[PDB]
Amino acid sequence: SVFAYESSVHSTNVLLSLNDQRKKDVLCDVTIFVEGQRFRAHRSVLAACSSYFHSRIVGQADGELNITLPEEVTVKGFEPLIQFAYTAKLILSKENVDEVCKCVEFLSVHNIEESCFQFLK
Amino acid sequence: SVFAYESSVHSTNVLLSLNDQRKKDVLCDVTIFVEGQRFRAHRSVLAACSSYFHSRIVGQADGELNITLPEEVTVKGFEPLIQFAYTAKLILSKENVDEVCKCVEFLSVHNIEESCFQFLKF
Amino acid sequence: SVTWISAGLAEAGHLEGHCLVRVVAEELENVRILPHTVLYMADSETFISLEETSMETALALEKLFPKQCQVLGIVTPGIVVTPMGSGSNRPQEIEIGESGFALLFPQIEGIKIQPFHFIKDPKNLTLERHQLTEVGLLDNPELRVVLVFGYNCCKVGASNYLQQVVSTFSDMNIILAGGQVDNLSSLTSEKNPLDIDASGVVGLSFSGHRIQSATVLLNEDVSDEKTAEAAMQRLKAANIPEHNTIGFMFACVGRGFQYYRAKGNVEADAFRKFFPSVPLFGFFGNGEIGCDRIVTGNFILRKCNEVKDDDLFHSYTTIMALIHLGS
Residue A3 placed within a domain? no
**Domain count within chain B:** 1
Q: Using CB atoms, which residue from C299, C303, C304 is nearest to A7?
A: C299
Chain C neighbors of B104, CB-CB under 8 A: none
Interface check B95 vs A, CB under 8 A: no
| Cα distance between the two ends of chain C | 10
Resolution (A): 3.8
Region label for B68, one of left (φ > 0), alpha (ψ between -120 and 50) or beta (otherwise):
beta
* CATH code at position B18: 3.30.710.10
Rounded to whole angstroms, the Cα distance separating B45 from A15 reads 9
Closest-CA residue in chain A for B61? A27
In a domain, A80, yes or no: yes
Residue C202: beta bridge partners? C117, C149
Angstrom distances, CA of residue C280 to CA of A119, C221, C243, C286, C288? 49, 23, 13, 20, 18
Chain C residues in contact with A12 (beta carbon < 8 A):
none
CB contact at 8 A, C252 and C284? yes
The DSSP code sequence of B72-98 is TS-HHHHHHHHHHHHHSB--B-TTHHH
Cα C188 to the center of its chain, rounded Å: 17
Q: What is the strand order of the sheet C200-203 is part of? A: C116-119, C200-203, C149-151, C180-181
Closest C-alpha to C203, from C310, C283, C299? C283
The whole-angstrom distance between A32's CA and the closest CA on chain B is 18
- Total residue count of chain B as it appears in this document: 122
B7 touches chain C (CB under 8 A): no
Q: Taking CB atoms and an 8 Å limit, are B15 and A14 in contact across chains?
A: yes
User: Quick one: how far is CA A95 from the chain centroid?
Assistant: 20
In a domain, A39, yes or no: yes
Structural domain includes residue B16 = yes
How far apart are alpha carbons C316 and C219 in whole angstroms? 8
Name residue A48's beta-bridge partners: none
Q: What is the Cα–Cα distance from C254 to C179, expressed in whole angstroms?
A: 14
Burial of C191 (C-beta count, 10 Å sphere; 0-12/13-18/19+): exposed
Cβ under 8 Å to C: A residues 24-83: none
CA distance linking residue C304 with residue C76, whole number of Å: 32
Alpha-carbon distance B72 to nearest alpha carbon in chain A (angstroms): 24
Closest CA to C178 of C157, C158, C196, C204: C204
Q: Give domain status of residue B99, yes or no.
A: yes
Q: Is A63 helix (H, G, I), strand (E, B) or coil?
A: coil
Scored b (16 or more CB within 10 A) or e, A27-53 reads: bebbebebeeeebebbbbbbbbbbebb
Q: How was this structure determined?
A: cryo-EM
Q: How far apart are CA C219 and CA C210, in angstroms?
A: 29
CA distance C312 to C292: 9
Burial class (CB in 10 A: 0-12, 13-18, 19+), C97: middle
CA C237 – CA A66 distance, rounded (Å): 52
* Chain C residue nearest residue B113, CA to CA: C299
Distance CA B49, CA B98 (A): 21
Interatomic CA distance for residues C271 and C275, integer angstroms: 6
Interface list for B 21-60 with A (CB within 8 A): 21, 26-27, 29, 42-45, 47-49, 57-59
Structural domain of residue B57, as residue ranges?
10-105
Kindly state whether residue A121 falls inside one of the protein's structural domains. no
Give the type of residue at C108.
Answer: I
The answer to whether residue A40 sits within a structural domain is yes
Does residue B114 lie in a domain region? no
Q: Give strand pairing partners of C48.
A: none
Q: Roughly how many angstroms between the first and final C-alpha of chain B, as a whole number?
A: 54
Domain boundaries, chain C: 3-105
